[PDB]
Amino acid sequence: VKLAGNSSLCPINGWAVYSKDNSIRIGSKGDVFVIREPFISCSHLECRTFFLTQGALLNDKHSNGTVKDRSPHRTLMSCPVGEAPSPYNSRFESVAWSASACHDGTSWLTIGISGPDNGAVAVLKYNGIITDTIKSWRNNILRTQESECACVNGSCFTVMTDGPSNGQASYKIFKMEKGKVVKSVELDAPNYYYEECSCYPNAGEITCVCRDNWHGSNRPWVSFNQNLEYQIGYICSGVFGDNPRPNDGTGSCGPVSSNGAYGVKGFSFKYGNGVWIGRTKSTNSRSGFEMIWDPNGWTETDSSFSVKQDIVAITDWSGYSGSFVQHPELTGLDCIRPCFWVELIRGRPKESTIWTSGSSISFCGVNSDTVGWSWPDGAELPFTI
Amino acid sequence: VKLAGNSSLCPINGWAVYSKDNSIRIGSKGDVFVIREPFISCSHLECRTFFLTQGALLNDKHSNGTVKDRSPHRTLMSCPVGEAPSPYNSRFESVAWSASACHDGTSWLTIGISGPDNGAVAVLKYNGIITDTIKSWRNNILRTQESECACVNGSCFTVMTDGPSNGQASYKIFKMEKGKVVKSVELDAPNYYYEECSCYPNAGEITCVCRDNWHGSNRPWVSFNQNLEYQIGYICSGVFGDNPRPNDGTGSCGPVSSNGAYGVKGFSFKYGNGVWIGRTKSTNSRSGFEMIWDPNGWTETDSSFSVKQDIVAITDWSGYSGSFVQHPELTGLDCIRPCFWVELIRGRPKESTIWTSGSSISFCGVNSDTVGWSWPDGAELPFTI
Amino acid sequence: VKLAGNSSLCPINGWAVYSKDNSIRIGSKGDVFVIREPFISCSHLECRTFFLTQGALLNDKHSNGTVKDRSPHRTLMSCPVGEAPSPYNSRFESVAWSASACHDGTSWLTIGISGPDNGAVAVLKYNGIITDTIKSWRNNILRTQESECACVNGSCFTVMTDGPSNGQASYKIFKMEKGKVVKSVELDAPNYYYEECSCYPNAGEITCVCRDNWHGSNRPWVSFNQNLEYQIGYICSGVFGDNPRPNDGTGSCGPVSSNGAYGVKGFSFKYGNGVWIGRTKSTNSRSGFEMIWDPNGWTETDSSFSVKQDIVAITDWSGYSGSFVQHPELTGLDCIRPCFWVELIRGRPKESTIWTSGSSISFCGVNSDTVGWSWPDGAELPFTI
Amino acid sequence: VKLAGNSSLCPINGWAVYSKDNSIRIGSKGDVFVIREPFISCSHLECRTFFLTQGALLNDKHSNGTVKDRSPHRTLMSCPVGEAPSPYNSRFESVAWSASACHDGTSWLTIGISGPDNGAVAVLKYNGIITDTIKSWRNNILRTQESECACVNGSCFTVMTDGPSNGQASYKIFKMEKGKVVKSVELDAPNYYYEECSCYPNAGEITCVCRDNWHGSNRPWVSFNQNLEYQIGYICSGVFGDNPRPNDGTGSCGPVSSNGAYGVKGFSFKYGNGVWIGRTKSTNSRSGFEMIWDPNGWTETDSSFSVKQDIVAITDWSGYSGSFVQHPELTGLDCIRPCFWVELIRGRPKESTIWTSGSSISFCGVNSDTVGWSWPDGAELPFTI
Numbered sequence A, B, C, D: 001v002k003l004a005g006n007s008s009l010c011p012i013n014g015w016a017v018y019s020k021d022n023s024i025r026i027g028s029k030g031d032v033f034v035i036r037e038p039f040i041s042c043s044h045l046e047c048r049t050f051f052l053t054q055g056a057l058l059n060d061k062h063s064n065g066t067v068k069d070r071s072p073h074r075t076l077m078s079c080p081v082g083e084a085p086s087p088y089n090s091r092f093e094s095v096a097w098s099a100s101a102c103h104d105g106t107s108w109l110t111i112g113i114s115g116p117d118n119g120a121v122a123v124l125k126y127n128g129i130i131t132d133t134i135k136s137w138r139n140n141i142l143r144t145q146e147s148e149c150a151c152v153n154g155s156c157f158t159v160m161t162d163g164p165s166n167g168q169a170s171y172k173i174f175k176m177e178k179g180k181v182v183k184s185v186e187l188d189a190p191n192y193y194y195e196e197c198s199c200y201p202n203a204g205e206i207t208c209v210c211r212d213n214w215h216g217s218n219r220p221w222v223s224f225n226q227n228l229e230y231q232i233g234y235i236c237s238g239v240f241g242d243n244p245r246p247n248d249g250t251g252s253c254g255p256v257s258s259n260g261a262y263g264v265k266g267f268s269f270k271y272g273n274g275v276w277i278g279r280t281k282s283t284n285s286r287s288g289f290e291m292i293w294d295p296n297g298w299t300e301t302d303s304s305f306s307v308k309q310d311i312v313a314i315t316d317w318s319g320y321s322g323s324f325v326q327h328p329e330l331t332g333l334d335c336i337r338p339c340f341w342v343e344l345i346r347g348r349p350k351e352s353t354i355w356t357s358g359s360s361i362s363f364c365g366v367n368s369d370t371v372g373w374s375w376p377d378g379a380e381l382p383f384t385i
């Protein structure tokens, strides 16, 4: 039976710790993949961590140069949530340096992009079998979510981008059924930039919060039907969501140009005209993490907010973050539960090592008591090498 | 179908060896977690060892300082009984530095406490999904069993403590159904101290035997209905159960104040007005282990007993111990079978290493012939480091 | 329910990346088998990589001399596709230095050849139980596919060879049901040489493309019914398929004698009178890999072709390659899907190491957009040793 | 449904290779248990290798002194057949320095002996739950098969010994149903010695071939009903089965006293008044292995035989060997299939290492063509240490 995706998001008060894989700490001795761009996605039965390996293990010479984003050796793999990603516990999914994945209630859909920068191809698989292919249409690093796609009523949804990372690019939404593209639409979004979208279902409608790598310190959003009829904007809150960014100030419901170049993958959950914003604590680097409840932040431009929950201290490295959801058919609830993960990047460029890898933590939205703290990576660098 | 928990404890004569994981011996070379506070719990189908990892492996630098009790990296994980806890065979359960777990016949309930000492939060999960949260009410190290909760008739029961470890603290019993707290009661127990309770079901009633860290060399007990109507006392036997303790002498059915400060997690099984006591062999340190049958020891104050079965020699390290149970729906018996595990602590503070970890052994109550021996940890310290 | 094998091959335009195991890269640190002769085969439910271990792990002294083809320690094992072959994730199949395997829709049939060069015995197993034996009939290295057998309608088919590798040998086709030989036929093929056949089903008929180690630079083929009534020939295309070989030129629908001695395991898919040829890029060594569509190449002798898709660069090592198929009962398609794997050999004789091993990549035929690239082994030799 | 055990042994011509785990070779680098006394046993669905670990891994300091037979750290564990025994692939069964195991068609029965030499206790488990206990009755190393028990019609059968290893001891047969002893009988066997019995079912009757450690160079046998009504004797063949032994000569249907002290675990399969004998090739040491068909050897005293099949060369170490069986409900045959395993011991006392461990090979009886060879351990000693 297919995930309905017809229920609204659960009301929540805060975020309870869900997982921590301690991957880098464990990899000091154990056989743990060098990875980055991890994400969590759930079915009607289980929750899995997906990740892009570098086809190499921590503390081994083949970890050399793994700051590098794209290679033929990068693979999408998955393991049960909270476990350190190892060749002994991980399922192979796809050859990929950019990925997405989601379960429709029947099978896993995985999307894996590999190939050359000027002609990359997204390979779609449904239950591990190739069901479709999407080829680069702008010949400039075809690239997708690095988090879970969204499913409603037997149809699953993703966003891909193609073109410059430093200017106007091309943005497409894709609708797939049983791993096959049945509809796509190019966004008519001049002056906007979409990348690395974190997309979730809410009462039959999909909302994505993305990365403006071009000229935005706030995050752009797209929301759409099951017919791909869409609306676009930027989160108006002056509690700026990207990294880097300016100090909190007067928002825009377009791109905030100070410190708008570059970015980091992130997410936010829309609650009416309010927003839950996950962001780094640093304005400059991928350091720290916090959840902020801003009850008029989706549409209003002020920097005032109601509630900050600490997740990672400023003195500790963070990285990418993304939404994931737990559906009624898994939880038994009457609503869709919002959750999030944070990637905890260690190594290059910030630290003197030959390698780059990430750990993960995750949290679920809860309508009971919670607490702020710091759950950092905890590895001691550098390694034996 | 839910575990009934309506049957009485099996009649037994002694204890037969059930498991030994050899974790520390194996971890000298293999990828074995640094752990402490292990415990065993069973379902209608399987038995699992739960444990608090230090988010690190034995013989690796990240094992440095693991004598330390609480950190953000500590996680509750589980593996099949008797297997060495490894990232390759362990299921992730929760982020936790204090834990409990039990199966109601349908799903695993896990309880994991993490967060700061002044505001820790117990995260409850049912089938791996968060179902409730309990926040520290005295802001002083919220802490739970470090052994299995008890289930009867689709309801599961645990004890938590909050407050000083050196004086009067606050003690609550919790009743949960499908991982959600449905009732709780604070114990009216002036001059008593409860901690690290080992709780088991017996004919619809739960009995816990706990640790008085304040001023008790004997163990306190609580027993209660499914309505949380309770009775309290201390084991009267002059065969004192805690560590440290005085020499065996004249018991109290209150706290025995000589050597009553500090303690160790332990258990006992009440059999009428008699008791099976598991305890260290040393009066001073966590060394050795023995089972003692004292047939009037629950209510009488003398130091005479009938039967001693050796489990670990005085010349070998022991540590925590706890009860676990095997229900009729798993065993096919007409009674609830009592079992116990012992944690075998190696390293700090007693030995010159940078790390602390534990192995485990376990035993089940049997109505046939058995034998005393020593089944110690067997690792040779120190390690390569 | 048995795999029907009554459907035709899917129409395709190109090849989409399916897997990459990164085995040698991972084995630099992790516990990965020294292997060669890997192959992929699927059931109605899963896809597995089969391989011949050397009964040893990479970067260990027992990897010494593993360029050697046959030993008592060689074993056939399998693991899920795309995972590095490890003692922790691999199923034991058979004692073997030559092998085949395939699933009939009910159970795995495995064929494992071990024993002395002058009297080797093929052990057939069905669901892991020995169901038959085939003994060497020419007393000179009995040897089979090193890729999947072919199944149609509850019957499975393989080819074995016995005799000289440098002249006329003896070639038999075998038909088995439930792992038991029910019919065999010796090919009447004077001046032909068959070895290491890659065999696939197409509408109830089996086609094998093989290795002429004697005097053929093009590949021989056999096709047959379920009654073992056969036809024989060589691929006529002047796009020569073997390694070594001459430059592309004027083909033969017999063996092309320039550079015809020695060879490499390979495959081709017949599409009418056209062919998809997989071959090394080098004419001399096992280097590079490419797919070539030659639309009249099965029967015509010219060297012109329509479509080249790059798979591995000339500057990188390749090795064996083979066909595998995915049936309608697994994919839900109305046709049999063609796929292929490539073995990426590292070490001896081409590189200064004490050992020889292979990685694998794989690709599936798709009727949508695809891209050429290089997905090489990526290990950096030599190893610690 | 229970294994019937009512069918006769399959007619066979020879032995086909079934498995080889390469454990010691793999353990040079990988995390492989130090073990000895392995054995294979099957259910209606799977085949598993059982083994007595030393609670330690190969090439680690805790392997020191593992020539030693009994310790508290020895555990019975199991893994799928042909896989190297690792903490990552092995199921914990029991705490044991002597063991037996067998499946009745419903669940695994395991028997594990631990405790002191003067009071050891056999712990019986059915589906991993303790169902009975058997205590030493002569207070002198209670000891059992080190191979599979035998099951017929929902009842399982084993042999245990207690007393001197250098003279008359006490020998009991045990009948169990659902892991509980329902009948036992002490053998009235003056001048006989039984130990380490290899027992198999044949048409409702159990036959065991054992080790006379006292004064027998030939093997003793017991055969019995489901009522424990028994007959006893020694294999009459002058093809002597034990190690050490004299040269082949004139047999006895009592103990052959030359070279009769000490022994090695072994087996034989009775076929009418004929026997299939598995034995070392050396008369002195545990070296080499061969299968011999002696068609009148059960009852006749001559040294002539019909058929020798080589299994391990004299120049290579062997060790224990034992029978195992595959029942009709697993294989689909109309008969019980005979199989055997050989333990390949490396290290002490014969080789200069600090440790002792064993690999395994196995073979099944087949009515088709087979071949003799040598499949030795293949590890190169000594190790890094």
Ligand SMILES: CC(=O)N[C@H]1[C@H]([C@H](O)[C@H](O)CO)OC(C(=O)O)=C[C@@H]1NC(=N)N
Residues within 6 Å of the ligand: A037, A052, A069, A070, A097, A098, A099, A141, A142, A143, A146, A165, A195, A196, A213, A263, A264
């Ligand atoms: C496909 C690709 O290379 N994506 C990049 C991503 C990208 O460079 C920016 O979003 C600009 O478009 O940046 C980052 C990053 O850490 O900023 C990592 C991602 N790496 C990987 N997914 N491998």
Ligand SMILES: CC(=O)N[C@H]1[C@H]([C@H](O)[C@H](O)CO)OC(C(=O)O)=C[C@@H]1NC(=N)N
Residues within 6 Å of the ligand: B037, B052, B069, B070, B097, B098, B099, B141, B142, B143, B146, B165, B195, B196, B213, B263, B264
């Ligand atoms: C939550 C916490 O830190 N609990 C402690 C426990 C505690 O200090 C005493 O019971 C006093 O309250 O003592 C010990 C101990 O070994 O004595 C270990 C436990 N460690 C862990 N559970 N991590």
Ligand SMILES: CC(=O)N[C@H]1[C@H]([C@H](O)[C@H](O)CO)OC(C(=O)O)=C[C@@H]1NC(=N)N
Residues within 6 Å of the ligand: C037, C052, C069, C070, C097, C098, C099, C141, C142, C143, C146, C165, C195, C196, C213, C263, C264
């Ligand atoms: C059974 C056997 O030894 N087969 C050989 C194969 C063979 O030598 C040639 O085809 C000539 O007949 O060559 C090769 C090879 O790399 O060329 C490896 C195979 N190795 C293994 N399958 N182990």
Ligand SMILES: CC(=O)N[C@H]1[C@H]([C@H](O)[C@H](O)CO)OC(C(=O)O)=C[C@@H]1NC(=N)N
Residues within 6 Å of the ligand: D037, D052, D069, D070, D097, D098, D099, D141, D142, D143, D146, D165, D195, D196, D213, D263, D264
């Ligand atoms: C229980 C016990 O210690 N059994 C011994 C066995 C025994 O010494 C002889 O049969 C004499 O009775 O000998 C041997 C042996 O290698 O000869 C190993 C067995 N070791 C183990 N099963 N651990």
Ligand SMILES: [Ca+2]
Residues within 6 Å of the ligand: A211, A212, A213, A214, A215, A216, A217, A242, A243, A244, A259, A260, A261, A262, A263, A264
């Ligand atoms: Ca930006």
Ligand SMILES: [Ca+2]
Residues within 6 Å of the ligand: B211, B212, B213, B214, B215, B216, B217, B242, B243, B244, B259, B260, B261, B262, B263, B264
């Ligand atoms: Ca105390």
Ligand SMILES: [Ca+2]
Residues within 6 Å of the ligand: C211, C212, C213, C214, C215, C216, C217, C242, C243, C244, C259, C260, C261, C262, C263, C264
């Ligand atoms: Ca050739």
Ligand SMILES: [Ca+2]
Residues within 6 Å of the ligand: D211, D212, D213, D214, D215, D216, D217, D242, D243, D244, D259, D260, D261, D262, D263, D264
């Ligand atoms: Ca003897």
